[PDB]
Amino acid sequence: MEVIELNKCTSGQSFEVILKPPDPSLEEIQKKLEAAEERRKYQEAELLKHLAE
Amino acid sequence: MRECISIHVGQAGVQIGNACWELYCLEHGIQPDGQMPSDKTIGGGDDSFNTFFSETGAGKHVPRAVFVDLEPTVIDEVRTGTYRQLFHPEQLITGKEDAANNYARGHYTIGKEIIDLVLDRIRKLADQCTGLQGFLVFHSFGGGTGSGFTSLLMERLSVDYGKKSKLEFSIYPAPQVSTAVVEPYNSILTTHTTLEHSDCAFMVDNEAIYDICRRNLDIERPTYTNLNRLISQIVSSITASLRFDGALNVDLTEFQTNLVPYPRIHFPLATYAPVISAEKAYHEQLSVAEITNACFEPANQMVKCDPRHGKYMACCLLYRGDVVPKDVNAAIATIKTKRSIQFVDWCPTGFKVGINYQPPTVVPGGDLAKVQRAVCMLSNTTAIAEAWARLDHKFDLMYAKRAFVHWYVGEGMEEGEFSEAREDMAALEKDYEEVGVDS
Amino acid sequence: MREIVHIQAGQCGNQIGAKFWEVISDEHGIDPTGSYHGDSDLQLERINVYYNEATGNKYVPRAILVDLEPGTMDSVRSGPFGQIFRPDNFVFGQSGAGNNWAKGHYTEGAELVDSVLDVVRKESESCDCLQGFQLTHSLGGGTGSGMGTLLISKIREEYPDRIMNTFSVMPSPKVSDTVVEPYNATLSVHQLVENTDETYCIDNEALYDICFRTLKLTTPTYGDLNHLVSATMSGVTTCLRFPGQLNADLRKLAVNMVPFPRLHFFMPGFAPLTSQYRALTVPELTQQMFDSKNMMAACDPRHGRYLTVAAIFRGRMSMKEVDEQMLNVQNKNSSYFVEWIPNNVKTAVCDIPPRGLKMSATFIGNSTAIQELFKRISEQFTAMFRRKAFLHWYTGEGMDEMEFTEAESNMNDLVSEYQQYQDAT
Amino acid sequence: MYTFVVRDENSSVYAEVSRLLLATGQWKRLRKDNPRFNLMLGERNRLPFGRLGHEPGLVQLVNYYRGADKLCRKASLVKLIKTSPELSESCTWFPESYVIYPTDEREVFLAAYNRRREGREGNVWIAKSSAGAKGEGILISSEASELLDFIDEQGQVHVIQKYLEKPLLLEPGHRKFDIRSWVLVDHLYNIYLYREGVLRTSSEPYNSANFQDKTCHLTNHCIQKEYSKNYGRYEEGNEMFFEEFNQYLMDALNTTLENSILLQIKHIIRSCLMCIEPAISTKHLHYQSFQLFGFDFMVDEELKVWLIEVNGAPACAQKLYAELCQGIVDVAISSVFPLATSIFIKLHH
Ligand SMILES: Nc1nc2c(ncn2[C@@H]2O[C@H](COP(=O)(O)OP(=O)(O)OP(=O)(O)O)[C@@H](O)[C@H]2O)c(=O)[nH]1
Ligand SMILES: Nc1ncnc2c1ncn2[C@@H]1O[C@H](COP(=O)(O)OP(=O)(O)CP(=O)(O)O)[C@@H](O)[C@H]1O
Ligand SMILES: Nc1nc2c(ncn2[C@@H]2O[C@H](COP(=O)(O)OP(=O)(O)O)[C@@H](O)[C@H]2O)c(=O)[nH]1
Ligand SMILES: COc1ccccc1NC(C)=C1C(=O)CC(c2ccccc2)CC1=O
Ligand SMILES: [Ca+2]
Ligand SMILES: [Ca+2]
Ligand SMILES: [Ca+2]
Ligand SMILES: [Ca+2]
Ligand SMILES: [Mg+2]
Ligand SMILES: [Mg+2]
Ligand SMILES: [Mg+2]
């Protein structure tokens, strides 16, 4: 039960008590967003082709 | 002094952000017009509250915040609300129509068209910072914007601000206050994509806030307004160390240093006490021992789970009000001899304690009574994995039938992202088990 | 923001559509001349969803009226609220469709469809942010069934990312005009399977049985049937038209109600249905709402399973009591909800009750029991088609038998698809 | 009406409990994976406690206490007794035990073993494991090497325990026995001792000069029914019930079952369950738990009671299923979900 690192100021205080010791790049993001946009475009083109038939 | 930029995404993020900045203004003595009489340095300074507020030459104190939603009805409430004079129009970003509770619509379809605009409005705030710490991101798991657009934003923030810390406040989905059914999908999808980009995330389960409001505030049917004012109190106690003089959690990095030994396991459990009804005419004020003991009651946790059947990696005690170290240690000593508090073997069994002498501030006309002392406990316990297990099971039920999957595929998402995200959650669940359970 | 464009096609479609506008205009305080005379600003908060603002404080329904003969729309223009509609939005021919899907879809309707799309385009271009379309029609005639589904296909071609919902009256031999209704309905259902997001299936036999058995109307008329439909449509659209819990456009609503694209045929219901001054308790509202006698698809929900369920309560009542009663109904009927869509029963409350009731409840069920309705149509279809009876009315308009065989196969597949999700665990 | 789900089909106790619930006309059984239940008759292993108590508006009850395994595993029961101050290393009603891996207590066990042979004391020990099921992994020996060679021969965690060399022997027969007590702990953590117990008796004469003949030493029902030729001779199925056993103690030793034995049994049951109460109580949890326990005891020739083990999923005596399962419905299930001369003894605390 040891208290350590006691710091005090006018606003309050803090301390520690111990009881016992023991990324995707910009281009890759753009690639994924554009890949999904192209899958949307392909699906919509299939719908428009279906409607054209 | 090092600035922090808050980002509020989607309805849940915006409304909670609105609740928080209202409370911040009350705590710092900032009037709705932005003026702050106690601030004697006009148009500048590097006080602790300047981490969250910039200053104009006219003496207005402006939140370092951006609000982004894919439809305008929620942010229009900010534009016309009590604190409308606080924010500049460029801080409030609204789209035309929303993501329809569809992660793929928020991440890919609509996110691609608005991400560059959001980054430019964020960059404008960063340019006013002499030493930017990083970002606090508020959002729901279940919404199409809160899940889909947040994960895209977090990815780009890691590109544009690689050194900066990013903290999340995430609303975990609860059927009691939701009319959606696809939220388990959106939660798993956004957790998978955001996991590597978030340094520390505080999950709030609407189920827990709802029941606390029912049980402790005697509100029969809590509204979002009830929930958000309670959530903003917890958020304020977590961010108070960034906004006031102190020596614990004084910058965002310290949150990871004190609460997250292993990067993927970065979801600390928050517990708050006391929550007292303002309508309660007669109330006896609770002691340091009583509010500290209440931090180990599951009924006061932001996520319902049983820490007795997990292990702790870190524990932080954040007090506000009439609290001195002597009473804290006397309370902790008693609690050890009565509670199941087991740490992992490779961590010290201890508590980092922070005390701010100013008692909690409550909104005039709110549901919460003023108390002489309160505490928020932040503990990294493996018991929070119970919340992942609940979510992953609901995901598994629907995904085995591919229910609702066509909505996501129809927005350009591939089906393999579902299983890739689910396998990542399976690994996350396994990580919690390896840390917290014996053979 | 969140504007809806309404279309009504054919005799049934225009008579039900007109009643719908009578009901919600009264709810919003709009008189027959389009002038507002309400007593609550809640009536105007979401008035733009269905009405346009003309100068002079006039509100004009965003409604397009379509028919291949002038008769019914002449009646509409003479009706109670006839003057409220934009005169430019009456689009009609003279030939009629002779209760013939081919005339509505391929010949007579094809000549008129472009001018309907012109009006649709004009209304859409004046929308701040178009939320989607709704169509009222019957499936058993020629204009609403054939030209209605032609319109839906043309609208999806021009507005491929806009929600399209329908209120579709299904034919019944017991409330029938011609023997070819099963042909027209079967041809139409396949169009709806592909091109709508939600289709509310209103069975004329259910409406008749409700009027006869529950309302004690000895001799129901189409007018009596349409009173039930307009009241149901009002309840179904309550949360779009009034402030409340739901902050959702049509897409968000469809996302949460439609787990598989083709299984989007909904079973609506309404409570109370009384033959009258007595107050209905929340238990009574909830119990009657889930009773098959209060639903309008003539399908027994106990014969299938609910994929998703939504309920809308109207009036001033205890939300706590609403939650308790909804849980009580779910436990009484635990076997009839699929267990692989968690929390698939959702509720919403609106404080504003409909005309003449202190409280009411509207039921929206996506149940696999709707397959019984398609089975009925399929049987009636096959009984005639096996002998190729009455086909000459259709081959005379250029159709051949193969298109009928494909429509039959398409609806039999739809029935099969329902059966597989009713047995899934 | 109430709903319940069955997830352990191999439970004889809760097959009868489920039968009674249905026969009330007020309980409906759902599919095992339907989450909208009030009562879960859960699985023995990996019961998903984390998914309980999150269904809106449903009070949910489960027939197992999360964390009660610490009492119901042989290795963890030894650890619990040694490391809990309320039980302590000096506990008088539990035999000297050590945990042995093939942490580990190999050297400490050898230490007390060496001292025991110094004073020429009885140096017989029994090695057992909870993973070894139904009389398999048991070995009794008076020499430590045979125990440890048998332990590391197996890959499972074992416990070596002092073998009670002086057991109370029933007459006629000169025969061993053990006492099974059934204990129900409800959601309020009331501790109910079923008034009816059973003695699982050996039908062979006890022979302390041969620990390889494990039929007169192991009082298991499966071991007696298979290996003992005198099975069922003195009592049906080698099961003597409290009325006869009490009459025997009065006739043979001029005392009663209540005085000589049952006071200690109640003390032990109460000490074990009160010890783990803070760790497993569901008093302020979002779901509630109850559990049926099977305590197994030994009695020595001095009428001292020793706890042997605690079973977390016990079976019941054939003639006692009806009464006990009705009691489970009464005090554990209907207490939370009420319907439209108690058989238990409440151990107070
Ligand atoms: N605590 C709290 N939760 C909220 C609030 N608003 C929404 N939620 C929760 O957030 C989830 C729905 O996500 P939203 O934030 O509304 O959706 P969104 O982020 O705006 O994204 P969209 O789908 O495009 O509308 C549900 O689980 C709601 O219960 C709020 O103000 N407070
Ligand atoms: N220390 C000891 N001294 C004397 N006998 C002992 C003993 N430990 C165990 N026994 C004997 O071994 C038998 C079975 O022991 P144990 O309870 O460990 O096995 P088990 O768990 O498979 C039976 P159950 O599951 O029904 O409780 C007991 O009936 C008892 O007679
Ligand atoms: N409920 C209702 N059904 C109608 C009405 N008018 C016609 N029907 C039904 O609609 C079908 C006939 O279609 P109808 O609309 O009259 O033909 P159309 O003008 O070519 O579209 C039959 O099934 C009729 O039973 C009506 O006013 N109300
Ligand atoms: C998940 O949505 C709900 C949850 C609880 C209670 C009610 C809801 N509303 C639901 C479930 C819907 C819809 O599907 C579409 C409806 C509609 C249909 C046709 C034209 C206009 C509007 C509006 C509507 O209100
Ligand atoms: Ca200043
Ligand atoms: Ca980073
Ligand atoms: Ca012509
Ligand atoms: Ca043209
Ligand atoms: Mg939104
Ligand atoms: Mg007609
Ligand atoms: Mg055993």
Coordinates of C-alpha atoms in Angstrom, one line a residue, chain D residues 61-325:
Chain D
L61 CA -32.5 -16.8 -14.7
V62 CA -29.9 -19.5 -15.3
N63 CA -29.3 -22.8 -13.4
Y64 CA -25.5 -22.2 -12.9
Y65 CA -23.4 -19.8 -10.9
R66 CA -20.7 -18.3 -13.0
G67 CA -17.4 -18.9 -11.1
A68 CA -18.7 -21.8 -9.1
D69 CA -16.2 -24.1 -10.9
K70 CA -13.6 -22.9 -8.4
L71 CA -15.4 -25.0 -5.9
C72 CA -16.2 -27.9 -8.3
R73 CA -12.8 -28.7 -9.7
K74 CA -10.4 -30.8 -7.5
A75 CA -7.3 -28.7 -8.3
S76 CA -9.1 -25.3 -7.8
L77 CA -10.8 -26.5 -4.7
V78 CA -7.4 -27.2 -3.1
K79 CA -6.2 -23.8 -4.2
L80 CA -9.3 -22.0 -2.9
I81 CA -9.0 -23.7 0.5
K82 CA -5.3 -23.0 0.9
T83 CA -5.4 -19.3 -0.3
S84 CA -8.7 -18.1 1.2
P85 CA -8.2 -16.8 4.8
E86 CA -11.8 -17.8 5.8
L87 CA -10.7 -21.4 4.9
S88 CA -6.9 -21.1 5.3
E89 CA -4.1 -23.7 5.2
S90 CA -5.1 -24.8 8.7
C91 CA -8.6 -25.9 7.7
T92 CA -9.6 -28.8 9.9
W93 CA -12.3 -30.6 7.8
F94 CA -10.4 -30.9 4.5
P95 CA -7.6 -33.5 4.1
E96 CA -4.0 -32.4 3.4
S97 CA -3.9 -31.9 -0.4
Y98 CA -1.4 -30.7 -2.9
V99 CA -1.7 -29.7 -6.6
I100 CA 0.8 -31.7 -8.8
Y101 CA 1.5 -30.9 -12.5
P102 CA 3.0 -33.7 -14.7
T103 CA 1.4 -23.5 -9.2
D104 CA 2.8 -26.9 -8.7
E105 CA 3.4 -28.2 -5.1
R106 CA 5.6 -31.3 -5.8
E107 CA 8.4 -30.3 -3.4
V108 CA 6.1 -29.2 -0.6
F109 CA 4.2 -32.5 -0.9
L110 CA 7.5 -34.4 -0.6
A111 CA 8.4 -32.3 2.5
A112 CA 5.3 -33.3 4.5
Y113 CA 5.7 -36.8 3.1
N114 CA 9.2 -37.1 4.4
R115 CA 8.2 -35.9 7.9
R116 CA 5.3 -38.3 7.9
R117 CA 7.6 -41.3 7.5
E118 CA 10.0 -39.9 10.1
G119 CA 7.4 -40.4 12.9
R120 CA 6.3 -43.8 11.3
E121 CA 2.9 -42.3 10.8
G122 CA 0.4 -43.6 8.3
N123 CA 1.8 -42.5 4.9
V124 CA -1.0 -43.5 2.5
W125 CA -2.1 -40.9 -0.1
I126 CA -4.7 -40.9 -2.9
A127 CA -4.0 -39.3 -6.3
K128 CA -6.9 -38.1 -8.3
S129 CA -7.9 -35.6 -11.0
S130 CA -11.2 -34.0 -12.0
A131 CA -10.4 -34.8 -15.7
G132 CA -10.3 -38.5 -14.9
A133 CA -13.9 -39.5 -15.0
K134 CA -15.7 -42.2 -13.0
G135 CA -13.1 -44.3 -11.2
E136 CA -10.4 -44.1 -13.9
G137 CA -7.5 -41.8 -12.8
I138 CA -7.5 -42.9 -9.1
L139 CA -4.4 -44.4 -7.5
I140 CA -4.0 -45.2 -3.8
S141 CA -0.4 -45.9 -2.5
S142 CA 1.7 -45.5 0.6
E143 CA 4.9 -44.8 -1.5
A144 CA 5.3 -41.4 -3.1
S145 CA 7.2 -42.5 -6.1
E146 CA 4.4 -44.7 -7.5
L147 CA 2.0 -41.7 -7.1
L148 CA 4.3 -39.2 -9.0
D149 CA 5.3 -41.7 -11.7
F150 CA 1.5 -42.3 -12.3
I151 CA 0.9 -38.5 -12.3
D152 CA 3.5 -37.5 -14.9
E153 CA 2.4 -40.6 -16.9
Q154 CA -0.8 -38.6 -17.4
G155 CA -0.9 -35.2 -19.0
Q156 CA -3.6 -33.8 -16.7
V157 CA -3.4 -31.7 -13.6
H158 CA -3.8 -33.9 -10.5
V159 CA -4.2 -33.6 -6.7
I160 CA -2.5 -35.8 -4.1
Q161 CA -4.6 -36.0 -1.0
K162 CA -4.1 -37.7 2.4
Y163 CA -6.0 -41.0 2.3
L164 CA -8.3 -41.4 5.3
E165 CA -6.8 -44.6 6.7
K166 CA -9.4 -44.9 9.5
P167 CA -12.9 -44.6 8.0
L168 CA -16.1 -45.3 9.8
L169 CA -17.1 -48.9 8.8
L170 CA -20.7 -50.0 8.7
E171 CA -21.6 -53.3 10.4
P172 CA -22.1 -55.9 9.3
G173 CA -19.7 -55.9 6.4
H174 CA -16.8 -53.9 7.8
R175 CA -17.4 -51.6 4.8
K176 CA -16.7 -48.0 3.7
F177 CA -19.1 -45.4 2.5
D178 CA -19.5 -41.7 1.5
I179 CA -22.3 -39.2 2.1
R180 CA -23.8 -37.2 -0.7
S181 CA -25.6 -34.0 0.2
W182 CA -27.6 -32.0 -2.3
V183 CA -27.5 -28.2 -1.8
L184 CA -29.5 -25.6 -3.7
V185 CA -28.4 -21.9 -3.7
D186 CA -31.1 -19.6 -5.0
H187 CA -30.8 -16.2 -6.6
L188 CA -30.8 -14.4 -3.2
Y189 CA -27.9 -16.7 -2.1
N190 CA -30.0 -18.5 0.4
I191 CA -28.4 -21.9 1.0
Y192 CA -30.9 -24.8 1.1
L193 CA -29.7 -28.2 2.3
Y194 CA -32.0 -31.0 1.0
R195 CA -33.2 -32.9 4.1
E196 CA -32.6 -36.2 2.3
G197 CA -29.1 -37.4 1.6
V198 CA -27.7 -40.8 0.5
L199 CA -24.8 -43.0 1.6
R200 CA -22.9 -44.6 -1.3
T201 CA -21.6 -47.7 0.4
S202 CA -19.0 -50.3 -0.5
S203 CA -20.4 -53.8 -0.4
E204 CA -16.9 -55.3 0.2
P205 CA -15.0 -55.6 3.5
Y206 CA -12.5 -52.8 4.0
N207 CA -9.0 -54.1 3.7
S208 CA -6.2 -51.7 4.6
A209 CA -3.5 -54.1 3.6
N210 CA -4.2 -54.0 -0.1
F211 CA -4.9 -50.7 -1.8
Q212 CA -4.9 -52.2 -5.3
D213 CA -8.3 -53.9 -4.7
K214 CA -10.0 -50.6 -5.3
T215 CA -13.5 -52.0 -4.8
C216 CA -13.5 -51.9 -1.0
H217 CA -11.8 -48.4 -1.1
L218 CA -13.7 -46.6 -3.9
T219 CA -17.4 -46.1 -3.0
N220 CA -18.5 -45.0 -6.5
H221 CA -21.8 -46.4 -7.7
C222 CA -20.3 -47.5 -11.0
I223 CA -17.3 -49.2 -9.4
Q224 CA -19.5 -51.1 -6.9
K225 CA -22.0 -52.2 -9.5
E226 CA -19.3 -53.5 -11.9
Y227 CA -16.6 -55.0 -9.6
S228 CA -18.2 -55.9 -6.3
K229 CA -19.9 -59.3 -6.2
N230 CA -21.9 -58.3 -3.1
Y231 CA -23.6 -55.4 -4.9
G232 CA -27.0 -54.7 -3.5
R233 CA -26.7 -57.3 -0.7
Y234 CA -27.1 -55.1 2.4
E235 CA -29.1 -52.3 0.7
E236 CA -30.6 -51.8 -2.7
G237 CA -28.0 -50.4 -5.1
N238 CA -25.5 -49.8 -2.3
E239 CA -27.5 -46.8 -1.3
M240 CA -28.5 -46.3 2.4
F241 CA -30.7 -43.3 3.2
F242 CA -30.8 -41.1 6.3
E243 CA -33.6 -42.9 8.2
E244 CA -31.7 -46.2 8.2
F245 CA -28.3 -44.7 8.8
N246 CA -29.7 -42.6 11.7
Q247 CA -31.2 -45.7 13.2
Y248 CA -27.9 -47.5 12.8
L249 CA -26.0 -44.7 14.6
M250 CA -28.6 -44.8 17.5
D251 CA -28.3 -48.6 17.8
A252 CA -24.6 -49.0 17.3
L253 CA -23.0 -45.8 18.7
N254 CA -25.8 -44.3 20.9
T255 CA -25.9 -41.0 18.9
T256 CA -27.9 -39.5 16.1
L257 CA -27.1 -38.4 12.5
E258 CA -27.9 -34.8 13.4
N259 CA -25.5 -34.6 16.3
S260 CA -22.6 -36.8 15.1
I261 CA -22.4 -35.8 11.5
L262 CA -25.0 -33.3 10.2
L263 CA -23.8 -30.4 12.3
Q264 CA -20.3 -30.7 10.7
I265 CA -21.8 -31.1 7.2
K266 CA -23.9 -27.9 7.6
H267 CA -20.9 -26.1 8.9
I268 CA -18.8 -27.2 5.9
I269 CA -21.4 -26.4 3.3
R270 CA -21.9 -23.0 4.8
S271 CA -18.2 -22.2 5.0
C272 CA -17.5 -23.1 1.3
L273 CA -20.4 -21.2 -0.2
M274 CA -20.0 -18.1 2.0
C275 CA -16.4 -18.0 1.0
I276 CA -17.1 -17.7 -2.7
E277 CA -20.2 -15.5 -2.3
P278 CA -18.6 -12.2 -3.2
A279 CA -17.1 -13.8 -6.4
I280 CA -20.3 -15.4 -7.7
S281 CA -23.3 -13.6 -6.2
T282 CA -25.7 -12.3 -8.8
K283 CA -27.5 -10.0 -6.3
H284 CA -26.8 -6.8 -8.3
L285 CA -26.4 -8.4 -11.7
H286 CA -28.4 -8.0 -14.9
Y287 CA -29.3 -11.7 -14.7
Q288 CA -29.9 -14.1 -11.8
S289 CA -28.4 -17.5 -11.1
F290 CA -29.2 -20.5 -9.0
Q291 CA -27.4 -23.8 -8.8
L292 CA -27.7 -27.4 -7.4
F293 CA -24.5 -28.7 -5.8
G294 CA -23.5 -32.2 -4.8
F295 CA -21.3 -32.2 -1.7
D296 CA -19.4 -35.5 -1.0
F297 CA -18.2 -36.3 2.5
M298 CA -16.3 -38.9 4.4
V299 CA -16.6 -39.9 8.1
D300 CA -13.8 -41.4 10.1
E301 CA -14.0 -43.7 13.1
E302 CA -14.0 -40.7 15.5
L303 CA -17.2 -39.4 13.8
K304 CA -15.3 -36.5 12.2
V305 CA -16.6 -35.3 8.8
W306 CA -14.2 -34.6 6.0
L307 CA -15.1 -32.8 2.7
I308 CA -14.0 -34.8 -0.3
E309 CA -15.2 -32.8 -3.3
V310 CA -18.1 -30.7 -4.6
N311 CA -19.9 -31.6 -7.8
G312 CA -21.5 -28.7 -9.8
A313 CA -23.7 -30.9 -12.0
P314 CA -24.7 -33.7 -9.7
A315 CA -27.2 -36.5 -10.3
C316 CA -29.8 -37.5 -7.7
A317 CA -30.9 -40.8 -6.1
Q318 CA -33.5 -42.6 -8.1
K319 CA -36.2 -42.4 -5.3
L320 CA -35.4 -38.8 -4.6
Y321 CA -35.8 -37.2 -8.0
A322 CA -39.5 -36.3 -7.7
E323 CA -39.2 -34.6 -4.3
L324 CA -36.0 -32.7 -5.0
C325 CA -36.9 -31.5 -8.5

